[PDB]
Each structure stands twice: as structure tokens, then as C-alpha cells.
mmCIF file of N, CA and C (backbone and C1' of nucleotides) in Angstrom:
data_model
loop_
_atom_site.group_PDB
_atom_site.id
_atom_site.type_symbol
_atom_site.label_atom_id
_atom_site.label_comp_id
_atom_site.label_asym_id
_atom_site.label_seq_id
_atom_site.Cartn_x
_atom_site.Cartn_y
_atom_site.Cartn_z
ATOM 1 N N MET A 1 8.834 90.993 -97.544
ATOM 2 C CA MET A 1 9.652 89.928 -98.130
ATOM 3 C C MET A 1 9.750 90.127 -99.640
ATOM 4 N N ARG A 2 10.538 91.094 -100.111
ATOM 5 C CA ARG A 2 10.788 91.277 -101.538
ATOM 6 C C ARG A 2 11.762 90.223 -102.072
ATOM 7 N N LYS A 3 11.330 88.962 -102.079
ATOM 8 C CA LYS A 3 11.843 87.848 -102.867
ATOM 9 C C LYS A 3 11.042 86.620 -102.435
ATOM 10 N N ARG A 4 10.334 85.995 -103.382
ATOM 11 C CA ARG A 4 9.464 84.838 -103.210
ATOM 12 C C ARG A 4 8.785 84.872 -101.853
ATOM 13 N N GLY A 5 7.922 85.859 -101.708
ATOM 14 C CA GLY A 5 7.095 86.123 -100.528
ATOM 15 C C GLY A 5 6.638 84.824 -99.852
ATOM 16 N N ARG A 6 6.071 83.944 -100.677
ATOM 17 C CA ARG A 6 5.830 82.508 -100.496
ATOM 18 C C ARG A 6 6.682 81.842 -99.414
ATOM 19 N N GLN A 7 7.972 81.955 -99.647
ATOM 20 C CA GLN A 7 9.079 81.226 -99.067
ATOM 21 C C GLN A 7 10.381 81.914 -99.498
ATOM 22 N N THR A 8 10.854 82.885 -98.727
ATOM 23 C CA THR A 8 12.199 83.399 -98.902
ATOM 24 C C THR A 8 13.169 82.380 -98.289
ATOM 25 N N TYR A 9 13.952 81.678 -99.104
ATOM 26 C CA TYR A 9 15.044 80.854 -98.598
ATOM 27 C C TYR A 9 16.204 81.799 -98.260
ATOM 28 N N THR A 10 16.509 81.987 -96.980
ATOM 29 C CA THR A 10 17.582 82.864 -96.533
ATOM 30 C C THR A 10 18.956 82.187 -96.600
ATOM 31 N N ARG A 11 19.977 83.000 -96.891
ATOM 32 C CA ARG A 11 21.403 82.692 -96.867
ATOM 33 C C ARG A 11 21.766 81.536 -95.939
ATOM 34 N N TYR A 12 21.579 81.674 -94.624
ATOM 35 C CA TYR A 12 21.983 80.647 -93.660
ATOM 36 C C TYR A 12 21.520 79.256 -94.083
ATOM 37 N N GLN A 13 20.275 79.135 -94.532
ATOM 38 C CA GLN A 13 19.769 77.864 -95.014
ATOM 39 C C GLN A 13 20.607 77.479 -96.242
ATOM 40 N N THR A 14 20.690 78.380 -97.219
ATOM 41 C CA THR A 14 21.451 78.201 -98.450
ATOM 42 C C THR A 14 22.953 77.915 -98.223
ATOM 43 N N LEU A 15 23.522 78.251 -97.064
ATOM 44 C CA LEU A 15 24.928 78.007 -96.767
ATOM 45 C C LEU A 15 25.193 76.513 -96.662
ATOM 46 N N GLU A 16 24.647 75.895 -95.615
ATOM 47 C CA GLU A 16 24.953 74.513 -95.297
ATOM 48 C C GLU A 16 24.329 73.587 -96.330
ATOM 49 N N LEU A 17 23.168 73.964 -96.860
ATOM 50 C CA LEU A 17 22.511 73.212 -97.911
ATOM 51 C C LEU A 17 23.416 73.107 -99.145
ATOM 52 N N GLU A 18 24.122 74.180 -99.521
ATOM 53 C CA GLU A 18 25.094 74.092 -100.606
ATOM 54 C C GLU A 18 26.166 73.054 -100.295
ATOM 55 N N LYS A 19 26.668 73.113 -99.070
ATOM 56 C CA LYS A 19 27.747 72.259 -98.603
ATOM 57 C C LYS A 19 27.309 70.787 -98.636
ATOM 58 N N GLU A 20 26.121 70.477 -98.109
ATOM 59 C CA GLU A 20 25.499 69.174 -98.283
ATOM 60 C C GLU A 20 25.460 68.811 -99.762
ATOM 61 N N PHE A 21 24.821 69.642 -100.582
ATOM 62 C CA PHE A 21 24.669 69.401 -102.010
ATOM 63 C C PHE A 21 26.001 69.014 -102.653
ATOM 64 N N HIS A 22 27.067 69.752 -102.337
ATOM 65 C CA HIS A 22 28.403 69.470 -102.831
ATOM 66 C C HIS A 22 28.772 68.009 -102.555
ATOM 67 N N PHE A 23 28.569 67.559 -101.320
ATOM 68 C CA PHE A 23 28.892 66.202 -100.912
ATOM 69 C C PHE A 23 27.956 65.172 -101.547
ATOM 70 N N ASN A 24 26.660 65.472 -101.528
ATOM 71 C CA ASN A 24 25.570 64.534 -101.758
ATOM 72 C C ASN A 24 24.309 65.254 -102.235
ATOM 73 N N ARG A 25 24.072 65.245 -103.548
ATOM 74 C CA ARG A 25 22.815 65.676 -104.137
ATOM 75 C C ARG A 25 21.713 64.732 -103.650
ATOM 76 N N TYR A 26 21.936 63.438 -103.886
ATOM 77 C CA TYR A 26 21.099 62.349 -103.420
ATOM 78 C C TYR A 26 21.193 62.301 -101.900
ATOM 79 N N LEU A 27 20.061 62.334 -101.205
ATOM 80 C CA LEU A 27 19.977 61.927 -99.814
ATOM 81 C C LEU A 27 19.235 60.595 -99.829
ATOM 82 N N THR A 28 19.689 59.585 -99.089
ATOM 83 C CA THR A 28 18.791 58.480 -98.781
ATOM 84 C C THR A 28 17.568 59.081 -98.070
ATOM 85 N N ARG A 29 16.380 58.622 -98.464
ATOM 86 C CA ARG A 29 15.098 59.288 -98.281
ATOM 87 C C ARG A 29 15.007 60.106 -96.988
ATOM 88 N N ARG A 30 14.914 59.435 -95.846
ATOM 89 C CA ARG A 30 14.574 60.047 -94.575
ATOM 90 C C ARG A 30 15.713 60.867 -93.965
ATOM 91 N N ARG A 31 16.879 60.967 -94.606
ATOM 92 C CA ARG A 31 17.839 62.007 -94.246
ATOM 93 C C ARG A 31 17.202 63.374 -94.555
ATOM 94 N N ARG A 32 16.399 63.477 -95.624
ATOM 95 C CA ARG A 32 15.731 64.725 -95.991
ATOM 96 C C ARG A 32 14.976 65.304 -94.781
ATOM 97 N N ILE A 33 14.278 64.445 -94.035
ATOM 98 C CA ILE A 33 13.528 64.816 -92.840
ATOM 99 C C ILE A 33 14.474 65.456 -91.822
ATOM 100 N N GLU A 34 15.618 64.816 -91.579
ATOM 101 C CA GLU A 34 16.580 65.264 -90.576
ATOM 102 C C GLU A 34 17.044 66.700 -90.922
ATOM 103 N N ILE A 35 17.346 66.969 -92.195
ATOM 104 C CA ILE A 35 17.614 68.335 -92.656
ATOM 105 C C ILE A 35 16.416 69.234 -92.327
ATOM 106 N N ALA A 36 15.228 68.790 -92.741
ATOM 107 C CA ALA A 36 13.994 69.571 -92.671
ATOM 108 C C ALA A 36 13.766 70.137 -91.268
ATOM 109 N N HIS A 37 13.995 69.324 -90.238
ATOM 110 C CA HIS A 37 13.940 69.801 -88.866
ATOM 111 C C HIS A 37 15.140 70.696 -88.554
ATOM 112 N N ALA A 38 16.364 70.253 -88.854
ATOM 113 C CA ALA A 38 17.574 71.023 -88.556
ATOM 114 C C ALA A 38 17.489 72.490 -89.015
ATOM 115 N N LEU A 39 16.843 72.742 -90.159
ATOM 116 C CA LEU A 39 16.700 74.081 -90.733
ATOM 117 C C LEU A 39 15.296 74.683 -90.601
ATOM 118 N N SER A 40 14.303 73.921 -90.153
ATOM 119 C CA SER A 40 12.932 74.396 -89.970
ATOM 120 C C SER A 40 12.255 74.749 -91.295
ATOM 121 N N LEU A 41 12.273 73.777 -92.206
ATOM 122 C CA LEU A 41 11.593 73.773 -93.493
ATOM 123 C C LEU A 41 10.640 72.569 -93.493
ATOM 124 N N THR A 42 10.009 72.246 -94.619
ATOM 125 C CA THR A 42 9.179 71.052 -94.789
ATOM 126 C C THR A 42 9.929 70.056 -95.684
ATOM 127 N N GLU A 43 9.693 68.744 -95.526
ATOM 128 C CA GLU A 43 10.352 67.695 -96.307
ATOM 129 C C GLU A 43 10.373 68.072 -97.790
ATOM 130 N N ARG A 44 9.193 68.436 -98.299
ATOM 131 C CA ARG A 44 8.956 68.958 -99.636
ATOM 132 C C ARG A 44 10.121 69.847 -100.057
ATOM 133 N N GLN A 45 10.341 70.907 -99.295
ATOM 134 C CA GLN A 45 11.265 71.969 -99.633
ATOM 135 C C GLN A 45 12.705 71.441 -99.689
ATOM 136 N N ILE A 46 13.050 70.447 -98.865
ATOM 137 C CA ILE A 46 14.382 69.851 -98.917
ATOM 138 C C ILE A 46 14.530 68.948 -100.148
ATOM 139 N N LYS A 47 13.447 68.391 -100.699
ATOM 140 C CA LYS A 47 13.543 67.836 -102.042
ATOM 141 C C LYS A 47 13.827 68.997 -102.988
ATOM 142 N N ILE A 48 12.899 69.954 -103.013
ATOM 143 C CA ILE A 48 12.765 70.950 -104.056
ATOM 144 C C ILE A 48 14.031 71.766 -104.216
ATOM 145 N N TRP A 49 14.548 72.361 -103.147
ATOM 146 C CA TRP A 49 15.760 73.161 -103.231
ATOM 147 C C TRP A 49 16.862 72.379 -103.963
ATOM 148 N N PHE A 50 17.040 71.114 -103.574
ATOM 149 C CA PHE A 50 18.056 70.248 -104.151
ATOM 150 C C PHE A 50 17.695 69.905 -105.594
ATOM 151 N N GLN A 51 16.451 69.510 -105.865
ATOM 152 C CA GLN A 51 15.968 69.152 -107.197
ATOM 153 C C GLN A 51 16.264 70.315 -108.142
ATOM 154 N N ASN A 52 15.733 71.481 -107.801
ATOM 155 C CA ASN A 52 15.937 72.731 -108.511
ATOM 156 C C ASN A 52 17.413 72.992 -108.805
ATOM 157 N N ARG A 53 18.253 72.966 -107.766
ATOM 158 C CA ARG A 53 19.691 73.090 -107.954
ATOM 159 C C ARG A 53 20.209 72.056 -108.973
ATOM 160 N N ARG A 54 19.942 70.757 -108.762
ATOM 161 C CA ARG A 54 20.383 69.668 -109.638
ATOM 162 C C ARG A 54 20.052 69.955 -111.101
ATOM 163 N N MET A 55 18.772 70.206 -111.368
ATOM 164 C CA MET A 55 18.229 70.455 -112.691
ATOM 165 C C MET A 55 19.157 71.373 -113.487
ATOM 166 N N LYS A 56 19.392 72.573 -112.956
ATOM 167 C CA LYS A 56 20.223 73.567 -113.611
ATOM 168 C C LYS A 56 21.683 73.102 -113.611
ATOM 169 N N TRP A 57 22.187 72.702 -112.441
ATOM 170 C CA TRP A 57 23.549 72.222 -112.227
ATOM 171 C C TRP A 57 23.989 71.250 -113.325
ATOM 172 N N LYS A 58 23.107 70.352 -113.764
ATOM 173 C CA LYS A 58 23.413 69.429 -114.842
ATOM 174 C C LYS A 58 23.819 70.192 -116.106
ATOM 175 N N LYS A 59 23.003 71.142 -116.569
ATOM 176 C CA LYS A 59 23.340 71.951 -117.736
ATOM 177 C C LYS A 59 24.687 72.652 -117.503
ATOM 178 N N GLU A 60 24.902 73.194 -116.302
ATOM 179 C CA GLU A 60 26.005 74.109 -116.042
ATOM 180 C C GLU A 60 27.362 73.414 -115.868
ATOM 181 N N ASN A 61 27.427 72.328 -115.094
ATOM 182 C CA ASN A 61 28.657 71.885 -114.430
ATOM 183 C C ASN A 61 29.505 70.989 -115.337
ATOM 184 N N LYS A 62 29.987 71.589 -116.420
ATOM 185 C CA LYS A 62 30.974 71.046 -117.349
ATOM 186 C C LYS A 62 30.542 69.673 -117.875
ATOM 187 N N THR A 63 29.384 69.632 -118.514
ATOM 188 C CA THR A 63 28.790 68.411 -119.019
ATOM 189 C C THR A 63 28.942 68.350 -120.538
ATOM 190 N N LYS A 64 30.180 68.254 -121.031
ATOM 191 C CA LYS A 64 30.389 67.800 -122.398
ATOM 192 C C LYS A 64 29.977 66.324 -122.496
ATOM 193 N N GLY A 65 30.027 65.748 -123.698
ATOM 194 C CA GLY A 65 29.661 64.354 -123.935
ATOM 195 C C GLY A 65 28.144 64.176 -124.002
ATOM 196 N N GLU A 66 27.429 64.791 -123.056
ATOM 197 C CA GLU A 66 25.986 64.966 -122.996
ATOM 198 C C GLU A 66 25.398 65.013 -124.417
ATOM 199 N N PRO A 67 24.510 64.081 -124.806
ATOM 200 C CA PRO A 67 23.973 64.002 -126.158
ATOM 201 C C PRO A 67 23.555 65.374 -126.689
ATOM 202 N N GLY A 68 24.101 65.793 -127.829
ATOM 203 C CA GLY A 68 23.856 67.104 -128.399
ATOM 204 C C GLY A 68 25.204 67.723 -128.724
ATOM 205 O "O5'" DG B 1 -1.252 50.390 -100.952
ATOM 206 C "C5'" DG B 1 -0.921 50.898 -99.679
ATOM 207 C "C4'" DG B 1 0.563 51.275 -99.632
ATOM 208 C "C3'" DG B 1 1.008 52.344 -100.640
ATOM 209 O "O3'" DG B 1 1.047 53.644 -100.085
ATOM 210 C "C1'" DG B 1 2.663 50.682 -100.144
ATOM 211 P P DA B 2 -0.091 54.706 -100.437
ATOM 212 O "O5'" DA B 2 0.495 56.134 -100.024
ATOM 213 C "C5'" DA B 2 0.918 56.409 -98.700
ATOM 214 C "C4'" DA B 2 2.355 56.953 -98.722
ATOM 215 C "C3'" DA B 2 2.485 58.294 -99.465
ATOM 216 O "O3'" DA B 2 3.240 59.198 -98.674
ATOM 217 C "C1'" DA B 2 3.926 56.612 -100.412
ATOM 218 P P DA B 3 3.630 60.676 -99.154
ATOM 219 O "O5'" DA B 3 5.156 60.472 -99.541
ATOM 220 C "C5'" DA B 3 6.135 60.214 -98.544
ATOM 221 C "C4'" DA B 3 7.416 59.622 -99.148
ATOM 222 C "C3'" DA B 3 8.039 60.482 -100.243
ATOM 223 O "O3'" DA B 3 8.820 61.529 -99.708
ATOM 224 C "C1'" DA B 3 8.205 58.136 -100.697
ATOM 225 P P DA B 4 9.268 62.781 -100.595
ATOM 226 O "O5'" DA B 4 10.700 62.457 -101.257
ATOM 227 C "C5'" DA B 4 11.863 62.217 -100.474
ATOM 228 C "C4'" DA B 4 12.961 61.443 -101.242
ATOM 229 C "C3'" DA B 4 13.773 62.216 -102.288
ATOM 230 O "O3'" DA B 4 15.167 61.876 -102.245
ATOM 231 C "C1'" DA B 4 12.610 60.344 -103.263
ATOM 232 P P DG B 5 16.257 62.752 -103.048
ATOM 233 O "O5'" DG B 5 16.339 62.284 -104.573
ATOM 234 C "C5'" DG B 5 17.003 61.090 -104.950
ATOM 235 C "C4'" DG B 5 16.523 60.558 -106.310
ATOM 236 C "C3'" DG B 5 16.530 61.546 -107.478
ATOM 237 O "O3'" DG B 5 17.820 61.771 -108.029
ATOM 238 C "C1'" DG B 5 14.679 59.990 -107.544
ATOM 239 P P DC B 6 18.056 62.973 -109.069
ATOM 240 O "O5'" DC B 6 17.306 62.667 -110.436
ATOM 241 C "C5'" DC B 6 17.696 61.635 -111.322
ATOM 242 C "C4'" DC B 6 16.663 61.556 -112.452
ATOM 243 C "C3'" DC B 6 16.605 62.851 -113.270
ATOM 244 O "O3'" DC B 6 17.444 62.755 -114.421
ATOM 245 C "C1'" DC B 6 14.412 61.841 -112.827
ATOM 246 P P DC B 7 18.150 64.052 -115.044
ATOM 247 O "O5'" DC B 7 16.976 65.049 -115.487
ATOM 248 C "C5'" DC B 7 16.329 64.872 -116.737
ATOM 249 C "C4'" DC B 7 14.988 65.615 -116.855
ATOM 250 C "C3'" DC B 7 15.011 67.141 -116.755
ATOM 251 O "O3'" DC B 7 15.487 67.773 -117.944
ATOM 252 C "C1'" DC B 7 12.969 66.081 -115.894
ATOM 253 P P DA B 8 15.274 69.329 -118.259
ATOM 254 O "O5'" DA B 8 13.811 69.449 -118.858
ATOM 255 C "C5'" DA B 8 13.461 68.771 -120.051
ATOM 256 C "C4'" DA B 8 11.964 68.866 -120.329
ATOM 257 C "C3'" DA B 8 11.561 70.296 -120.695
ATOM 258 O "O3'" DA B 8 10.623 70.284 -121.752
ATOM 259 C "C1'" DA B 8 10.452 69.522 -118.680
ATOM 260 P P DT B 9 10.040 71.623 -122.396
ATOM 261 O "O5'" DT B 9 8.711 71.991 -121.572
ATOM 262 C "C5'" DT B 9 7.621 71.073 -121.534
ATOM 263 C "C4'" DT B 9 6.885 71.070 -120.183
ATOM 264 C "C3'" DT B 9 5.808 72.148 -119.971
ATOM 265 O "O3'" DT B 9 4.551 71.487 -119.967
ATOM 266 C "C1'" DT B 9 7.080 71.649 -117.987
ATOM 267 P P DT B 10 3.138 72.233 -120.069
ATOM 268 O "O5'" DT B 10 2.848 72.960 -118.687
ATOM 269 C "C5'" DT B 10 2.010 72.369 -117.709
ATOM 270 C "C4'" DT B 10 2.155 73.097 -116.370
ATOM 271 C "C3'" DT B 10 1.614 74.534 -116.353
ATOM 272 O "O3'" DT B 10 0.256 74.562 -115.928
ATOM 273 C "C1'" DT B 10 3.622 74.172 -115.030
ATOM 274 P P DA B 11 -0.531 75.899 -115.535
ATOM 275 O "O5'" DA B 11 -0.030 76.193 -114.052
ATOM 276 C "C5'" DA B 11 -0.424 77.318 -113.295
ATOM 277 C "C4'" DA B 11 0.217 77.143 -111.913
ATOM 278 C "C3'" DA B 11 0.162 78.379 -111.012
ATOM 279 O "O3'" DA B 11 0.259 77.901 -109.673
ATOM 280 C "C1'" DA B 11 2.394 77.912 -111.626
ATOM 281 P P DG B 12 -0.007 78.817 -108.394
ATOM 282 O "O5'" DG B 12 1.126 79.920 -108.388
ATOM 283 C "C5'" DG B 12 2.286 79.763 -107.594
ATOM 284 C "C4'" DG B 12 3.336 80.816 -107.929
ATOM 285 C "C3'" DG B 12 2.821 82.249 -108.100
ATOM 286 O "O3'" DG B 12 2.676 82.896 -106.853
ATOM 287 C "C1'" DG B 12 4.771 81.674 -109.389
ATOM 288 P P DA B 13 2.241 84.422 -106.704
ATOM 289 O "O5'" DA B 13 3.636 85.190 -106.598
ATOM 290 C "C5'" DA B 13 4.496 84.926 -105.503
ATOM 291 C "C4'" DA B 13 5.967 85.216 -105.790
ATOM 292 C "C3'" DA B 13 6.291 86.708 -105.784
ATOM 293 O "O3'" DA B 13 7.255 86.948 -104.777
ATOM 294 C "C1'" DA B 13 7.099 85.576 -107.773
ATOM 295 P P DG B 14 7.752 88.404 -104.377
ATOM 296 O "O5'" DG B 14 8.905 88.727 -105.426
ATOM 297 C "C5'" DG B 14 9.035 90.016 -105.982
ATOM 298 C "C4'" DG B 14 10.157 90.015 -107.020
ATOM 299 C "C3'" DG B 14 10.056 91.213 -107.965
ATOM 300 O "O3'" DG B 14 10.622 92.379 -107.409
ATOM 301 C "C1'" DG B 14 10.437 89.206 -109.178
ATOM 302 O "O5'" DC C 1 8.957 89.717 -123.869
ATOM 303 C "C5'" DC C 1 9.662 88.540 -123.528
ATOM 304 C "C4'" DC C 1 10.177 88.636 -122.087
ATOM 305 C "C3'" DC C 1 11.029 87.431 -121.672
ATOM 306 O "O3'" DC C 1 12.389 87.805 -121.785
ATOM 307 C "C1'" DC C 1 9.666 88.357 -119.908
ATOM 308 P P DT C 2 13.583 86.749 -121.857
ATOM 309 O "O5'" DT C 2 13.985 86.307 -120.375
ATOM 310 C "C5'" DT C 2 14.816 87.128 -119.570
ATOM 311 C "C4'" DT C 2 14.735 86.723 -118.095
ATOM 312 C "C3'" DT C 2 15.372 85.369 -117.735
ATOM 313 O "O3'" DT C 2 16.688 85.587 -117.205
ATOM 314 C "C1'" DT C 2 13.305 85.901 -116.520
ATOM 315 P P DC C 3 17.788 84.405 -117.032
ATOM 316 O "O5'" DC C 3 17.445 83.611 -115.699
ATOM 317 C "C5'" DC C 3 17.794 84.172 -114.439
ATOM 318 C "C4'" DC C 3 16.909 83.701 -113.282
ATOM 319 C "C3'" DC C 3 17.325 82.398 -112.566
ATOM 320 O "O3'" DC C 3 17.514 82.768 -111.202
ATOM 321 C "C1'" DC C 3 14.991 82.513 -112.942
ATOM 322 P P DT C 4 18.102 81.816 -110.034
ATOM 323 O "O5'" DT C 4 16.830 80.946 -109.602
ATOM 324 C "C5'" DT C 4 15.766 81.615 -108.937
ATOM 325 C "C4'" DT C 4 14.469 80.840 -108.690
ATOM 326 C "C3'" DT C 4 14.515 79.697 -107.668
ATOM 327 O "O3'" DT C 4 14.143 80.273 -106.431
ATOM 328 C "C1'" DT C 4 12.772 79.550 -109.309
ATOM 329 P P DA C 5 14.228 79.533 -105.033
ATOM 330 O "O5'" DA C 5 12.943 78.588 -104.920
ATOM 331 C "C5'" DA C 5 11.685 79.129 -104.532
ATOM 332 C "C4'" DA C 5 10.491 78.277 -104.990
ATOM 333 C "C3'" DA C 5 10.340 76.877 -104.362
ATOM 334 O "O3'" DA C 5 9.240 76.867 -103.462
ATOM 335 C "C1'" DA C 5 9.766 76.976 -106.703
ATOM 336 P P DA C 6 8.868 75.625 -102.513
ATOM 337 O "O5'" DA C 6 8.083 74.609 -103.479
ATOM 338 C "C5'" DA C 6 6.724 74.880 -103.810
ATOM 339 C "C4'" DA C 6 6.174 74.138 -105.036
ATOM 340 C "C3'" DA C 6 5.983 72.621 -104.874
ATOM 341 O "O3'" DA C 6 4.594 72.307 -104.877
ATOM 342 C "C1'" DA C 6 6.743 73.284 -107.065
ATOM 343 P P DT C 7 4.015 70.839 -104.575
ATOM 344 O "O5'" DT C 7 3.468 70.230 -105.947
ATOM 345 C "C5'" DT C 7 2.218 70.598 -106.503
ATOM 346 C "C4'" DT C 7 2.084 70.020 -107.922
ATOM 347 C "C3'" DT C 7 2.070 68.484 -107.993
ATOM 348 O "O3'" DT C 7 0.744 67.960 -107.869
ATOM 349 C "C1'" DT C 7 3.437 69.532 -109.741
ATOM 350 P P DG C 8 0.421 66.407 -107.583
ATOM 351 O "O5'" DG C 8 0.660 65.604 -108.943
ATOM 352 C "C5'" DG C 8 -0.166 65.765 -110.093
ATOM 353 C "C4'" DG C 8 0.448 65.084 -111.329
ATOM 354 C "C3'" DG C 8 0.625 63.561 -111.197
ATOM 355 O "O3'" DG C 8 -0.404 62.881 -111.901
ATOM 356 C "C1'" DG C 8 2.580 64.696 -112.155
ATOM 357 P P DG C 9 -0.624 61.289 -111.862
ATOM 358 O "O5'" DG C 9 0.485 60.559 -112.750
ATOM 359 C "C5'" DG C 9 0.345 60.456 -114.155
ATOM 360 C "C4'" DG C 9 1.523 59.738 -114.827
ATOM 361 C "C3'" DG C 9 1.590 58.230 -114.519
ATOM 362 O "O3'" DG C 9 1.876 57.519 -115.726
ATOM 363 C "C1'" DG C 9 3.621 59.333 -113.959
ATOM 364 P P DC C 10 2.049 55.915 -115.801
ATOM 365 O "O5'" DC C 10 3.594 55.592 -115.613
ATOM 366 C "C5'" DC C 10 4.530 55.751 -116.659
ATOM 367 C "C4'" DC C 10 5.951 55.553 -116.113
ATOM 368 C "C3'" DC C 10 6.231 54.149 -115.536
ATOM 369 O "O3'" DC C 10 7.302 53.524 -116.235
ATOM 370 C "C1'" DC C 10 7.067 55.908 -114.145
ATOM 371 P P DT C 11 7.676 51.971 -116.050
ATOM 372 O "O5'" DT C 11 8.601 51.885 -114.753
ATOM 373 C "C5'" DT C 11 10.003 52.085 -114.850
ATOM 374 C "C4'" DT C 11 10.650 52.247 -113.470
ATOM 375 C "C3'" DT C 11 10.465 51.069 -112.507
ATOM 376 O "O3'" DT C 11 11.446 50.049 -112.648
ATOM 377 C "C1'" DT C 11 10.544 53.292 -111.463
ATOM 378 P P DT C 12 11.469 48.727 -111.723
ATOM 379 O "O5'" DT C 12 12.227 49.096 -110.353
ATOM 380 C "C5'" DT C 12 13.590 49.489 -110.354
ATOM 381 C "C4'" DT C 12 13.988 50.250 -109.076
ATOM 382 C "C3'" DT C 12 14.196 49.422 -107.792
ATOM 383 O "O3'" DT C 12 15.413 49.881 -107.214
ATOM 384 C "C1'" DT C 12 12.693 51.240 -107.421
ATOM 385 P P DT C 13 16.139 49.210 -105.962
ATOM 386 O "O5'" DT C 13 15.285 49.583 -104.668
ATOM 387 C "C5'" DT C 13 15.328 50.877 -104.099
ATOM 388 C "C4'" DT C 13 14.264 50.999 -103.007
ATOM 389 C "C3'" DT C 13 14.259 49.884 -101.944
ATOM 390 O "O3'" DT C 13 14.692 50.333 -100.677
ATOM 391 C "C1'" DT C 13 12.075 50.696 -102.565
ATOM 392 P P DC C 14 16.233 50.566 -100.321
ATOM 393 O "O5'" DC C 14 16.436 49.846 -98.896
ATOM 394 C "C5'" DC C 14 15.998 50.426 -97.674
ATOM 395 C "C4'" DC C 14 14.630 49.923 -97.180
ATOM 396 C "C3'" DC C 14 14.680 48.744 -96.191
ATOM 397 O "O3'" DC C 14 14.463 49.188 -94.867
ATOM 398 C "C1'" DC C 14 12.772 48.718 -97.635
#
DNA sequence: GAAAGCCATTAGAG
DNA sequence: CTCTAATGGCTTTC
């Protein structure tokens, strides 16, 4: 596993997860669980992948006005 | 009441 | 050294 041996997040997971993210960064809490089973990850990881994406996405996704 | 939500930082692999 | 994956306190929460 030459990429985050820990946890390689594979394409297929990253496919639909992107599509979800596009619609809804925020999940009402226990929707996260429903994803977690659907893709065979842990609740944790369905926070994290999205959190991680959000964090950067804020800087990236045409955020003028943003103090600074 | 423990959970996502916020975020830079903090391990963590490349 | 670079981008990612994951940690905590504060806040609401159903």
C-alpha cells in the first residue's frame, strides 16, 4: 500500500463521497453512520475525510471577502 | 449526555 | 519538507 498504509482511501470511496460533499458537507449526525456502513469505513473516517476536504476547500473555493 | 460541527495545529505517511 | 489524516475544548444538541 504505497499511499497512507494506515488507510488508503481508494477512488471508489472518493467518487461518491465527493458527490455527497458537493451536495452536503454537513451531514446531520447519524447520516455519517449510514455512509460508514455503505462504504465499509468507521464513523470517524466519514467525519475526517469530509472535515479534511472542507478545511482546504474553504481556502480554495473562491472565498474573496474572507477577512484578509 | 457523547456526538458532529469549527479550525489550526499535531502526528503521520509519502 | 509536503499534503493528509486525525486529535482536543467550546458550542449546540435531540
